[PDB]
Design a protein around this ligand. Structure first.
Ligand code: ATP
Ligand code: ZN
Lengths: 139, 286, 191, 287, 50, 39, 94
């Protein structure tokens, strides 16, 4: 009998689905989200959601009227998608840049050297840099 | 050529209701009609159908008629309401392969290239799937007739669809052997499966009925597969079957041992989670 | 008007293959079918005229329709060639008339025979008493050439209008390639 | 008069025609007619549904073609069996159900022929198994609304059983149309021939399932299951601590060993026992 | 003809808007995710032929 | 494991009422629902 | 003719039954495996070949007796092994 009710509840996650973003929960299985409409709400949630899939800053799904949690989402951003890598390389060689021996090697140390050789920074523990600024005259 | 067919519950009932609506004839009428649908990615599909007016006399049972005007107007209405939907073949109600069902296909093959027929069941009982589809093949061959043509059965199954499953599971409401765990396969194929092998053992016994008494043609094209079965009966128990068999059983039971080894400890932890819910509730509440 | 439906059974047999009557047999009996279906059409707008044959392959060349453009289109380069099989002509003439839009119609069939028949008279008296059990009046009009003083047909029409049938006729073929309009001017005048 | 106990018997097939025709052209309000026998003053048993093709682009219930339903009407009269026109439908697609102002006018065109024509809405999105969202309605007279007189004169405890949906109750629900409690008609003739035919395997349980990779997969769970058992060697260790309601809220960011653990024991169990038994029936059945 | 041209507006006044949107990405074959020129982001489907 | 099941289920107690939602807040839901339905 | 128990003949037996010498029976059976009428492996050092598949021939109403009998008690092994499944697997699902 119970398994008739079990899959029965998921009709609300039909298709007219609006998007919020998870913020926190008061307790177990009742929470607070931040809508893409700009306002925030105290909402309820579907029980079958693995709650441990929540909170990087979770893209969640809201019912359009009853305004409660529906579904957890894979991430999305509508900026430069990801630099599509085929027709996206600005075909500039390192040899195209002449006369930047210090700074090109130095930024190589700062960016992709901890990317690959991470466990030297980890093992010696020299705190690889979080972000990097570069400036100067234009051109 | 044609891999298999896709049959829907909508066409499945959409024959049976017509057998009901001509069920008032009492005496004899086969439900023959026009089978509609597509075939894509070398997969046959059956989506819509209707039935044609048909009569038949037992004397001179080589005479059939399809009102092809009724075939044109209603299928024009069907292409009109649905340009996606088209013809896919035909069907007859198929108790036992009636005899006009050699040319019904040759009568209306001018519409569909692989003008497929479908035998259905009117009184549903078997230990399998009572849905049949043939296909037309012809032969200028071997020894039966210089004009020879016999249907060959393509494998047949009931195609499901997300649209129709709401109506299917809605209109079941009776019983459904879900909770697919350690015993779904046991009953859908290990209980039902060996009895599946029962009838397949029985059908070669039904062919064995001609040792000296049955029909007059003897074998020709039966016995290569028959010799192939007993030729290809599997290997006997003398080598590593029992060895490597004991090896791999002897490895699978390790994993079983670990799983049972965890499960008890889990439920024990759960009982400790109950005794905290007992001992510090009896003094607190009373 | 009166309820019937005309189902003409053309003769596409291999003995219907000369230019004996005027133009051709094909245009002669074809335009015979055209003027009698204009007769049945203008006498009653409900009647539909389709053509079946009694050949080796009794094809529904045209579906039973009140339109005649399919009849005129298919009867051009129709190739009326084949082995005649009249023993299935009775059932292929009858079961279509049970396939029709109304069994309330008068079951009326014209039949064209212009070939030597190899039926059994026992078989067509079984089918003839079958048509006694089915209450069907068929007026057979003979074309072409045939076994003269048409053999097995007088007994078939006689065993068709028997048991108070008494309304059917057998227009026999004259063995002269005349103009065939006056050959069929009597069935268009009286039954 | 009526007793608001109107008990519509429909079908087993008409539901399927409504879902298919309501589903294939779903974002437009598709429509059509209802073709069944009109039984007595209270009930109606409509056995068949045939759909009408649309007119043009536009979500509408635009017009009927009485040419089309005329030839369609006599089509089955001269092929199948005669039936009777009774009602009609449309499709509020992902709405639920009500009578719109457009729906009520073409309704009002259909009650003029027979006073007991039927307004039918299907909603083929919000329907899963036990949900169908049908609720056939019919107009109530706005004359009696001006009378202030309560219609339909309830003599049976059969009407006020279901409670009305609020999206219908926004609409003319209690002022312009009423609901009807319905059911369906099914038989054993249909039940077995769909139950024994939907999910049936063939010889699959009598197979081996990738005999070099069944055991390889049997490692491919155990390997991460060990470290998940290290989380299980982790999470118990913060008990006799802060109250487990805090251990209920607090564990919605990071994974538990507890549920994830008992998952894989079930998985590795059922994965192994089926291959183990299926591997051994063939040793006797085959030689 | 004057009644026919005014019969063109007897039904021609019935087209509805088709709010100008933009495709963000596509979740599954029928699950889509968009955002119009208005505000928030929605989850949406299409027609089966388009 | 079976005994860790059979010894386990004595705890299950003091499960007094599975209250669905409410009564008076249901009357307020049909009340404000009646306001939006007339609206 | 040899059953599926052994079906392992030797080159001396080909040199007896076909009276063809030791140094030509291997060239005979390499040609036989190239044509594909028989399918079996060739050992050289134990002078035996492991023939597995034979080309199917035709047969009279007498071989169907032996195939019928090897079928008949093969039915009841399915009945017998299935009987434990129905009996022991009875309470798992009624
Ligand atoms: N080896 C080089 N070193 C420095 N500049 C170079 C070199 N080769 C070419 N240039 C020129 O210097 C310019 C630097 O390009 P870039 O766009 O990086 O300038 P920028 O430092 O980003 O200044 P801006 O921000 O104004 O563009 C290029 O446009 C190029 O023409
Ligand atoms: Zn509507």
């Amino acid at each position: 009998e119970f398994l008739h009710a079990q899959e029965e509840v998921k009709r609300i996650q039909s298709i007219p689905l609006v998007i919020g973003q998870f913020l926190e929960a008061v307790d177990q299985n009742t929470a607070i989200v931040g809508s893409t409409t700009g306002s925030n709400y105290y909402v309820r949630i579907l029980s079958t959601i693995d709650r441990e899939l929540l909170k990087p800053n979770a893209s969640v799904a809201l019912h359009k009227h009853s305004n409660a949690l529906v579904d957890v989402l894979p991430p999305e951003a509508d900026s430069s998608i990801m630099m599509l890598t085929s027709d996206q390389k600005p075909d500039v060689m390192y040899a195209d840049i002449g006369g930047m021996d210090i700074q090109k090697q130095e930024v190589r140390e700062a960016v992709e050297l901890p990317l690959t050789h991470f466990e030297l920074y980890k093992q010696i523990g020299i705190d690889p840099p979080r972000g990097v600024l570069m400036y100067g005259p234009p051109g | 050529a044609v891999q298999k067919v896709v049959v829907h519950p909508l066409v499945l009932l959409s024959v049976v209701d017509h057998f009901n609506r001509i069920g008032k004839v009492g005496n004899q009428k086969r439900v023959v009609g026009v089978l509609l649908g597509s075939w894509q990615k070398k997969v046959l599909d059956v989506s819509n159908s209707f039935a044609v007016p048909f009569d038949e006399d037992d004397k001179d049972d080589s005479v059939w008629f399809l009102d092809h005007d009724y075939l044109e107007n209603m299928y024009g209405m069907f292409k009109k309401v649905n340009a996606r939907e088209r013809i896919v073949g035909w069907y007859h109600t198929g108790p036992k392969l009636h005899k006009n069902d050699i040319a019904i296909n040759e009568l209306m093959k001018r519409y569909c290239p692989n003008s497929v027929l479908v035998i259905i069941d009117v009184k549903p009982k078997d230990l399998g799937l009572p849905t049949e589809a043939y296909i037309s093949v012809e032969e200028v061959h071997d020894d039966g007739t210089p004009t020879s043509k016999t249907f060959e059965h393509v494998t047949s199954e009931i195609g499901a669809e997300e649209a129709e499953e709401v109506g299917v599971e809605h209109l079941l409401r009776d019983i459904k052997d879900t909770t697919v765990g350690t015993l779904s396969q046991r009953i859908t194929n290990q209980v039902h499966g060996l009895k599946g092998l029962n009838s397949k053992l029985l059908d070669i016994r039904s062919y064995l009925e001609k040792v000296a008494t049955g029909k007059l043609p003897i074998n020709h094209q039966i016995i290569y597969q028959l010799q192939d079965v007993f030729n290809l009966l599997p290997d006997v128990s003398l080598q590593e079957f029992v060895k490597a068999f004991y090896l791999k059983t002897n490895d699978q039971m390790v994993v079983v041992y670990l799983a049972s080894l965890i499960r008890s400890v889990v439920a024990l932890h759960n009982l400790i989670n109950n005794k905290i819910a007992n001992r510090d509730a009896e003094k607190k509440e009373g | 008007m009166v309820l019937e439906s005309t189902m003409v059974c053309v003769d596409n047999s291999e003995y219907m293959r000369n230019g004996d009557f005027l133009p051709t047999r094909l245009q002669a009996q074809q335009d015979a079918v055209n003027i009698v279906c204009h007769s049945k059409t203008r006498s009653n707008p409900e009647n539909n005229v389709g053509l079946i044959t009694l050949a080796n392959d009794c094809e529904v060349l045209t579906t039973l329709t009140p339109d005649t453009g399919r009849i005129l289109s298919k009867l051009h380069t129709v190739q009326p060639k084949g082995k005649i099989t009249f023993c299935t002509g009775i059932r292929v003439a009858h079961l279509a008339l049970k396939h029709r839009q109304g069994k309330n119609h008068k079951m009326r069939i014209i039949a064209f025979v212009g070939s030597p028949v190899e039926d059994n008279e026992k078989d067509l008296v079984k089918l003839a008493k079958r048509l006694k059990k089915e209450k069907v009046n068929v007026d057979i009009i003979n074309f072409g050439e045939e076994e003269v003083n048409t053999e097995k047909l007088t007994a078939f029409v006689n065993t068709l209008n028997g048991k108070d049938g008494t309304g059917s006729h057998l227009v026999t073929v004259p063995p002269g390639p005349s103009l065939a309009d006056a050959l069929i001017s009597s069935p268009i005048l009286a039954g | 008069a009526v007793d608001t106990a109107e008990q519509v018997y429909i079908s087993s097939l008409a539901l399927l025609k409504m879902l298919k025709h309501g589903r294939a052209g779903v974002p437009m309000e598709v429509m059509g007619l209802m073709l069944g026998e009109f039984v007595d003053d209270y009930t109606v048993r409509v056995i068949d549904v045939f759909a009408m093709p649309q007119s043009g682009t536009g979500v509408s219930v635009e017009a009927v073609d009485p040419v089309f339903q005329a030839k369609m009407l006599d089509m089955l009269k001269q092929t199948g069996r005669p039936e009777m026109v009774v009602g009609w439908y449309h499709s509020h697609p992902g709405f639920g159900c009500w009578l719109s102002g457009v729906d009520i006018n073409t309704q009002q065109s259909f009650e003029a022929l027979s006073e007991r024509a039927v307004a039918v809405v299907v909603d083929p999105i919000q329907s899963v198994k036990g949900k169908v969202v049908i609720d056939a309605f019919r107009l109530i007279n706005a004359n009696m609304m001006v009378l202030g007189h309560e219609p339909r004169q309830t003599t049976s405890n059969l009407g006020h059983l279901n409670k009305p949906s609020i999206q219908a109750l926004i609409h003319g629900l209690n002022r312009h149309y009423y609901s009807i409690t319905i059911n369906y008609r099914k038989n054993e003739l249909e039940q077995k021939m769909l139950l024994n035919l939907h999910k049936k395997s063939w010889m699959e349980g009598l197979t081996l399932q990738d005999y070099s990779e069944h055991c390889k997969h049997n490692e491919s769970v155990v390997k991460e299951m060990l470290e998940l058992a290290k989380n299980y060697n982790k999470a118990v260790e913060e008990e006799d601590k802060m109250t487990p309601e805090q251990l209920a809220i607090k564990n919605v960011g990071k994974q538990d060993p507890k549920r994830h653990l008992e998952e894989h024991v079930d998985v590795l169990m059922t994965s192994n026992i089926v291959q183990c038994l299926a591997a051994m029936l063939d040793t006797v059945v085959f030689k | 003809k004057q009644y026919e041209k005014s019969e063109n507006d007897l039904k021609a006044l019935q087209s509805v808007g088709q709010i100008v949107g933009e495709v963000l990405k596509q979740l599954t074959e029928e699950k889509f995710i968009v955002k119009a020129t208005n505000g928030p982001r929605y989850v949406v489907g299409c027609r089966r032929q388009l | 494991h079976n005994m860790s099941v059979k010894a386990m289920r004595f705890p299950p107690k003091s499960y007094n009422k599975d209250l669905e939602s409410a009564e008076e807040r249901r009357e307020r839901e049909q009340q404000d629902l009646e306001f939006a339905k007339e609206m | 003719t040899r059953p599926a128990n052994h079906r392992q003949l030797t080159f001396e037996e080909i040199a007896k039954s076909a009276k063809i010498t030791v140094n030509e029976v291997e060239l005979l059976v390499m040609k036989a495996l190239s044509v594909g009428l028989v399918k079996g492996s060739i050992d050289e050092v134990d002078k035996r070949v492991h023939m597995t598949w034979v080309q199917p021939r035709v047969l009279d109403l007498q071989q169907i007796k032996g195939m019928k009998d090897r079928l008949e008690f093969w039915c009841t092994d399915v009945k017998s092994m299935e009987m434990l499944v129905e009996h022991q697997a009875h309470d798992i699902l009624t």
